[PDB]
Amino acid sequence: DSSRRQYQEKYKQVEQYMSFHKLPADFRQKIHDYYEHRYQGKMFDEDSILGELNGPLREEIVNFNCRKLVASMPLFANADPNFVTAMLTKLKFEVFQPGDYIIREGTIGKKMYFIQHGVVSVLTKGNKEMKLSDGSYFGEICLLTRGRRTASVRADTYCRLYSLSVDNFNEVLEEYPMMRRAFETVAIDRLDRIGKKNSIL
Amino acid sequence: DSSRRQYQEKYKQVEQYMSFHKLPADFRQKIHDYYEHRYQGKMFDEDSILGELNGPLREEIVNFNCRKLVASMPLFANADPNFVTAMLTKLKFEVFQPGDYIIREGTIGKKMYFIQHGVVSVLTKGNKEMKLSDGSYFGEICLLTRGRRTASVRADTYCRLYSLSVDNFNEVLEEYPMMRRAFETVAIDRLDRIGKKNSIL
Amino acid sequence: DSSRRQYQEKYKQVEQYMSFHKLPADFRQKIHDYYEHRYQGKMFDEDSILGELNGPLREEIVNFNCRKLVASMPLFANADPNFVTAMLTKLKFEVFQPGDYIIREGTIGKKMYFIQHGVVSVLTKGNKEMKLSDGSYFGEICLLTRGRRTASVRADTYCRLYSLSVDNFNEVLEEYPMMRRAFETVAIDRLDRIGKKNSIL
Amino acid sequence: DSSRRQYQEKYKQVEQYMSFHKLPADFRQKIHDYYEHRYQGKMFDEDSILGELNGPLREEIVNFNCRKLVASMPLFANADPNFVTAMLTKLKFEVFQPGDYIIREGTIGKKMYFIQHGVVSVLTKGNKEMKLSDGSYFGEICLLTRGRRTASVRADTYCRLYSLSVDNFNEVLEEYPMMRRAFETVAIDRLDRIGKKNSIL
Ligand SMILES: Nc1ncc2ncn([C@@H]3O[C@@H]4COP(=O)(O)O[C@H]4[C@H]3O)c2n1
Ligand SMILES: Nc1ncc2ncn([C@@H]3O[C@@H]4COP(=O)(O)O[C@H]4[C@H]3O)c2n1
Ligand SMILES: Nc1ncc2ncn([C@@H]3O[C@@H]4COP(=O)(O)O[C@H]4[C@H]3O)c2n1
Ligand SMILES: Nc1ncc2ncn([C@@H]3O[C@@H]4COP(=O)(O)O[C@H]4[C@H]3O)c2n1
Structure with a gap:
């Protein structure tokens, strides 16, 4: 929800930035592709998130993820x-x-x-x-x-x-x-x- | 109001993060329980808050709280x-x-x-x-x-x-x-x- | 507008924080009074504002203000x-x-x-x-x-x-x-x- | 969209700040002119934007822009x-x-x-x-x-x-x-x- 909406909104600002700087169409596609791969439709402030937790849960989460x-x-x-x-x-x-x-x-x-x-x-x-x-x-x-x-x-x-x-x-x-x-x-x-x-x- | 709404909204982002990383149900419950205990339904940016005040009021508040x-x-x-x-x-x-x-x-x-x-x-x-x-x-x-x-x-x-x-x-x-x-x-x-x-x- | 709305909203969060910590009525009044004196109904992120300008305008503004x-x-x-x-x-x-x-x-x-x-x-x-x-x-x-x-x-x-x-x-x-x-x-x-x-x- | 809306909103806060500090009309015009020249109707958090990308794309973008x-x-x-x-x-x-x-x-x-x-x-x-x-x-x-x-x-x-x-x-x-x-x-x-x-x- 807010994670998918964040991705869209953040990507929109990327589009306006690229447009503002007049980047070519291939470069724009390349940046779009990277965004898809890097974020896969969601954005989290993982910092803020992990910063709300404690040492033990952060460590448990990072071990699970990797x-x-x-x-x-x-x-x-x-x-x-x-x-x-x-x-x-x-x-x-x-x-x-x-x-x-x-x-x-x-x-x-x-x-x-x-x-x-x-x-x-x-x-x-x-x-x-x-x-x-x-x-x-x-x-x-x-x-x-x-x-x-x-x-x-x-x-x-x-x-x-x-x-x-x-x-x-x-x-x-x-x-x-x-x-x-x-x-x-x-x-x-x-x-x-x-x-x-x-x-x- | 904004403090209770902040808790809910922040917890929602936690849920989407856990979902994104596919954490198991017990781990999710554990994180939920911690959140309840740690924040008790409200979230304040105590930093920003205390940073709007002065030295004497911060000190008066911290003494009262502890x-x-x-x-x-x-x-x-x-x-x-x-x-x-x-x-x-x-x-x-x-x-x-x-x-x-x-x-x-x-x-x-x-x-x-x-x-x-x-x-x-x-x-x-x-x-x-x-x-x-x-x-x-x-x-x-x-x-x-x-x-x-x-x-x-x-x-x-x-x-x-x-x-x-x-x-x-x-x-x-x-x-x-x-x-x-x-x-x-x-x-x-x-x-x-x-x-x-x-x-x- | 957004400056007066910011004051109100920020003060509301102060009220919820004080309420959360159960501060006494006199202490609350004291904090309220300080807020009135310190911000006078408006809040600006003077940092962000001045950070959008240049050296010469910042300097011109600070000299005018003081x-x-x-x-x-x-x-x-x-x-x-x-x-x-x-x-x-x-x-x-x-x-x-x-x-x-x-x-x-x-x-x-x-x-x-x-x-x-x-x-x-x-x-x-x-x-x-x-x-x-x-x-x-x-x-x-x-x-x-x-x-x-x-x-x-x-x-x-x-x-x-x-x-x-x-x-x-x-x-x-x-x-x-x-x-x-x-x-x-x-x-x-x-x-x-x-x-x-x-x-x- | 959000980039043009950001410019307007940020400039509005500048206007309220100047008003709050009672700057003279010529100084206000000067600040307005600078804003037009410096931002040209749009505002990007170029930091946050570039910070979402990687080294190679940042470098490709900065070379293109300059x-x-x-x-x-x-x-x-x-x-x-x-x-x-x-x-x-x-x-x-x-x-x-x-x-x-x-x-x-x-x-x-x-x-x-x-x-x-x-x-x-x-x-x-x-x-x-x-x-x-x-x-x-x-x-x-x-x-x-x-x-x-x-x-x-x-x-x-x-x-x-x-x-x-x-x-x-x-x-x-x-x-x-x-x-x-x-x-x-x-x-x-x-x-x-x-x-x-x-x-x-
Ligand atoms: N009560 C008690 N008795 C013997 C102890 N030996 C060590 N500790 C505590 O455990 C702590 C383990 O971390 P630390 O060595 O930095 O400080 C130590 C002490 O606070 C002890 N605490
Ligand atoms: N007017 C006045 N007269 C004698 C003083 N002795 C000390 N102070 C001020 O109190 C201040 C206490 O803090 P500080 O010692 O860093 O600087 C000191 C001076 O500004 C004095 N001020
Ligand atoms: N074109 C030119 N000619 C003689 C100069 N003498 C000094 N400068 C520039 O003014 C500058 C004043 O700042 P700085 O001394 O750090 O660097 C100096 C040079 O870039 C000169 N520029
Ligand atoms: N597999 C392999 N074989 C010979 C190598 N010689 C250098 N590298 C890797 O390339 C790297 C280039 O960056 P670095 O020199 O800091 O560390 C180097 C190694 O990880 C090598 N990797």
């Missing part, structure tokens, strides 16, 4: 549930469209991404062309080294992702420094298979 | 009224349900809690099983030592609590360092009766 | 108009009721106050009983020394004041350190006539 | 598109009226300005009287030296500008320190032709 994400990703599946919960409560849902460059090589990285659904392509000068899909994550290397991105990552399909900011990543690893090692091992494995070696891990 | 809390808790009852007021204006009302773990042992603590109404259980590896009830507080030990929580605390009944963040606790003790001692003495007493000794107090 | 304040107070009347403007744009309007203690001796001070209209009483252990009225200011001593308040200040009548936070005071004196001296001289004069001497000025 | 600004200004036209995008996403649209002093000499500078449309006059004690117009920028010297403004800049016509804060300027030059040199060269050229020499560039 059951498949958690169970399909060994890093989350085998870890301390308190660590899992601390990660989940800071994740932000994002949708990307095919061809979008989620991450650009060389740039400075402020987030990593957990793939709920979709396929992306890790691209590099080298020619290394590796896919990643449901149950994996990426963008973690630059958060561990605080270097620049080691590759570009491009959306092949529509991608439903959950992002985690560099600040929250670090706040979580402060409390659970055990799990930093689990990220570094895979990060090393991955760099290894694109002729890279970082002494920082 | 008269029983203040008078039933010797730490507040016997102290400097300016200290009391400074604590009260920073307290945040929270409701917990039976079985909820308000605090987990070993974790890092960012708040303590004053019990307006309810019973909680301080749980520890040891086997020490102590209850606390109306007029007491907990969660203070980790704010004084900045260690990890010394025990878990679990709600036995519905609990009406007022929380105080670690930042506000410290801002208040900066202005009134006299009262830090009053927290440390009880903290020592409590650690003593669970075979703990911290040299930090 | 013409009598500026012209009646020699510190503002004789100074650099850019300094005046920088002070004015950071001032916050506040109303106090008779008997209110605006400032308490011994406490830590985070603001000073410019009197638009009203009489206050500077009170001290000593017995020094000095009035201040339209065109003067107070609360500046603790901002210059960062000590504790040197006296208590109490509202004799309804007081229309403009407050300035310690952060903004300092940001303004950074840009115009010339004017710090003008505050210190009066501050010294005032301390002198209550048997105080601070070497910090 | 095509003429980017293509007419060699600094942007010939640079790395990622640098351009990083600048554009932080720019804030502002409108100034004829006679307005956008920048005052001697003051401390917290922003620079890119001229979308309009003519301004760089004024100095000296007597140097230089115009700048569509496709140029100003206010950059104080951001590079962190001194005081080297001149005053005054609007000759209505000016459509995009401002960039000192914090964002620096965050962008951190990532692309190559382009600081491009600002310094012009800054030196400009100081040279008003008998100034700063060793800081």
Whole structure:
């Protein structure tokens, strides 16, 4: 009701904004498609909503909502549930469209991404062309080294992702420094298979 | 009027959110029950409201609202009224349900809690099983030592609590360092009766 | 229209809040009176409003609104108009009721106050009983020394004041350190006539 | 619809605010004119709007909206598109009226300005009287030296500008320190032709 009415009303304002700025018809369609995928006809102020509840219910809700994400990703599946919960409560849902460059090589990285659904392509000068899909994550290397991105990552399909900011990543690893090692091992494995070696891990 | 209408409208959005995420019927009931207890059919933007007033009226209102809390808790009852007021204006009302773990042992603590109404259980590896009830507080030990929580605390009944963040606790003790001692003495007493000794107090 | 309707609607929510907390009839009247004095039947989101404009119009508006304040107070009347403007744009309007203690001796001070209209009483252990009225200011001593308040200040009548936070005071004196001296001289004069001497000025 | 209704409604609140403060008729007209120029009958919460989208669409939208600004200004036209995008996403649209002093000499500078449309006059004690117009920028010297403004800049016509804060300027030059040199060269050229020499560039 108010959730479906909010979607319509908010989308209307998007239409008037695009009209005001005279965006072309293809660009408008693209934005429309993204809106459909990202919100699916409803809008919630999830912040305000979760902010009315308490810690325990928020945590119970986030665990319920991400059951498949958690169970399909060994890093989350085998870890301390308190660590899992601390990660989940800071994740932000994002949708990307095919061809979008989620991450650009060389740039400075402020987030990593957990793939709920979709396929992306890790691209590099080298020619290394590796896919990643449901149950994996990426963008973690630059958060561990605080270097620049080691590759570009491009959306092949529509991608439903959950992002985690560099600040929250670090706040979580402060409390659970055990799990930093689990990220570094895979990060090393991955760099290894694109002729890279970082002494920082 | 607008306060009762706000509750209904806000709860409706909660229902649509739960529906959207397909939460089970028991979880929905649990969230409904919490809402009833936490808001009791009305919603106020207490922030905005208090922000329209001045310092003196805010302080007069918070003292009126917490008269029983203040008078039933010797730490507040016997102290400097300016200290009391400074604590009260920073307290945040929270409701917990039976079985909820308000605090987990070993974790890092960012708040303590004053019990307006309810019973909680301080749980520890040891086997020490102590209850606390109306007029007491907990969660203070980790704010004084900045260690990890010394025990878990679990709600036995519905609990009406007022929380105080670690930042506000410290801002208040900066202005009134006299009262830090009053927290440390009880903290020592409590650690003593669970075979703990911290040299930090 | 929407400004008068906002006042009514906002006051209604205040009434429901007071009712919810069961405040006594005298306290309710007091809050009602304050509301009348503070808002005079209208409410504006002056922030949002001024935020739609630019720097030059904001500055022109604040100067227009405070013409009598500026012209009646020699510190503002004789100074650099850019300094005046920088002070004015950071001032916050506040109303106090008779008997209110605006400032308490011994406490830590985070603001000073410019009197638009009203009489206050500077009170001290000593017995020094000095009035201040339209065109003067107070609360500046603790901002210059960062000590504790040197006296208590109490509202004799309804007081229309403009407050300035310690952060903004300092940001303004950074840009115009010339004017710090003008505050210190009066501050010294005032301390002198209550048997105080601070070497910090 | 809601965008045109928002403009009207917001302007109405401006009228009631001006009425409340008893602004004169000329000042009211001036504010009305600014509103027309600045919003052109529509209001969007561009923040909220762009915040519903993702990084790639925001970036695509900002590039589309500023095509003429980017293509007419060699600094942007010939640079790395990622640098351009990083600048554009932080720019804030502002409108100034004829006679307005956008920048005052001697003051401390917290922003620079890119001229979308309009003519301004760089004024100095000296007597140097230089115009700048569509496709140029100003206010950059104080951001590079962190001194005081080297001149005053005054609007000759209505000016459509995009401002960039000192914090964002620096965050962008951190990532692309190559382009600081491009600002310094012009800054030196400009100081040279008003008998100034700063060793800081
Ligand atoms: N699967 C795979 N293989 C080799 C790789 N080299 C880099 N990456 C991912 O691309 C990412 C590019 O961003 P980042 O360097 O922050 O983290 C990098 C890794 O997640 C790789 N991913
Ligand atoms: N009553 C009681 N007795 C022994 C205790 N040992 C610890 N606590 C409380 O449990 C709390 C667990 O969180 P914390 O360690 O921050 O503060 C601790 C105390 O408030 C105790 N409370
Ligand atoms: N008029 C007057 N005379 C002696 C005073 N001694 C202190 N004050 C004011 O009371 C104020 C109490 O707060 P503060 O010490 O921050 O600044 C102090 C002065 O403005 C005095 N005001
Ligand atoms: N065109 C031109 N010529 C000489 C100049 N000397 C200073 N400026 C501009 O005026 C500006 C005044 O603000 P700022 O000193 O921060 O940057 C300065 C320059 O953009 C000048 N602009």
